[PDB]
């Protein structure tokens, strides 16, 4: 059928349609280290220095990348590429090579599969916020 | 009411017992009523035994002991937490603590 979960984190999402195609090196369709906010631009250069040029000649990952928030939209591209390699290798040859590159990527950094569960908590009685209380007079 | 059967002292079969002075307040307390402790400690404390032993001119000098006899009045024995107040039934127990 069609198995497609793409990449997402916190709030943002990189829809990663994985199929055969050109599959050039592009982030938001843009060059290697060229992103306008200019903050976390190295995170993708690392793996492609190990395998070689032949390996990305047939992996087209068409990404709809939407979402404001750096720690969301960044750190979701790493999740997306991890899942892209995982699915490609699992479906094509065997899960041992997927085992290997997933091993290096995930044991390399824990925080792809795990997102921050922290979120703004509820405001309560008699206070300006969640924990603070109004000044008590005597 | 009569709190203690022995009146809180150890005077049985005599009329007068000589008094002593509490080591803390110098209060006159009868020798049977006074609470007596006998501390046999080391002249040099544990944190200072090792350094004294290294500095000793004699090998295995075996350090001397300090023998001190303390007499407390009831107020000073209670304040210093040597003895505490006990329940009506636990008061009758004369067994010393195991230590």
């Amino acid at each position: 059928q069609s198995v497609q979960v793409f990449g997402r984190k916190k709030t943002a999402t990189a829809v990663a349609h994985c199929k055969r195609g050109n599959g050039l090196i592009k982030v938001n369709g843009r060059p290697l280290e060229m992103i306008e906010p200019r903050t976390l631009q190295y995170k993708l250069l690392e793996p492609v220095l190990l395998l070689g040029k032949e390996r990305f000649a047939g992996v087209d990952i068409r990404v709809r990348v939407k979402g404001g928030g750096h720690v969301a939209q960044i750190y979701a591209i790493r999740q997306s590429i991890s899942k892209a390699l995982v699915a490609y290798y699992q479906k094509y040859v065997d899960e041992a090579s997927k085992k290997e590159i997933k091993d290096i990527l995930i044991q390399y950094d824990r925080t792809l599969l795990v997102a921050d569960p922290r979120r703004c908590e509820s405001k309560k009685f008699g206070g300006p916020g969640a924990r603070a209380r109004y000044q008590k007079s005597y | 009411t009569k709190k203690r059967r022995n009146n809180g002292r150890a005077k049985k079969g005599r009329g007068h017992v000589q008094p002593i002075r509490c080591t803390n307040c110098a209060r006159c307390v009868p020798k049977d009523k006074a609470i007596k402790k006998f501390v046999i400690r080391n002249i040099v404390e544990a944190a200072a035994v090792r350094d004294i032993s290294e500095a000793s001119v004699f090998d295995a000098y075996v350090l001397p002991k300090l023998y001190v006899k303390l007499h407390y009045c009831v107020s000073c024995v209670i304040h210093s937490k040597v003895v505490r107040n006990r329940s009506r039934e636990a008061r009758k127990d004369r067994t010393p603590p195991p230590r």
Binding site: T39, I106, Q107, Y108, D109, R110, D116 | -
Partner: protein
């Protein structure tokens, strides 16, 4: 071209030991190519020290009310003008990490005394974790409360602290304050 990572090597880079990872330990899932991770270090104790003293120094510099937590500034400190000088030095790059603290590191402090009196302080020392906690908490706090309006201001606030942060010297100044008071406390024996 068999060198590991982008700045290290394995053929002839010998440290003749492995026992030199007291504050810096990057061998597991806690690796991210840049120290930009956001994240929390107050969820439970000992976590401020588990932040490696390099990341602690550069990222616990978030005090006062103008630069309180904003990680773009730690990104600037460690990202811009340090990876370049790592090779622009020409010499052995270990000097910057190994020229800071091995003689600076405070090895004792003390605690309040009795019910009346403050003229002395009962000596206490710790395993590295709480000594780093207390000593550099007070170090960062003093540096921020007094060094507000700093001539040593960011876009050049990598060199001095990255040379007097990790290990290998006795040259830091709030550290000299805490070491002199360390001797004062050490006098309690």
């Amino acid at each position: 071209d068999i060198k590991l990572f982008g700045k290290w090597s394995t053929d002839d880079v010998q440290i003749n030991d492995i026992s030199l990872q007291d504050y810096i330990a990057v061998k597991e899932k806690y690796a991210k190519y840049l120290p930009h991770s956001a994240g929390r270090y107050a969820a439970k104790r000992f976590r401020k020290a588990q932040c490696p003293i390099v990341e602690r120094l550069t990222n616990s510099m978030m005090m006062h009310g103008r630069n309180n937590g904003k990680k773009l500034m730690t990104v600037r400190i460690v990202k811009h003008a340090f990876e370049i000088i790592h090779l622009l030095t020409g010499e052995n790059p270990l000097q910057v990490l190994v020229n800071a603290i091995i003689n600076s590191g405070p090895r004792e402090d003390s605690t309040r005394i009795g019910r009346a009196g403050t003229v002395r302080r009962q000596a206490v020392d710790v395993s590295p974790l709480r000594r780093v906690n207390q000593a550099i908490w007070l170090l960062c706090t003093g540096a921020r409360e007094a060094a507000f309006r700093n001539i040593k201001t960011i876009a050049e606030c990598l060199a001095d602290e990255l040379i007097n942060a990790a290990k290998g010297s006795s040259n830091s100044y709030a550290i000299k304050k805490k070491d002199e008071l360390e001797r004062v406390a050490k006098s309690n024996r």
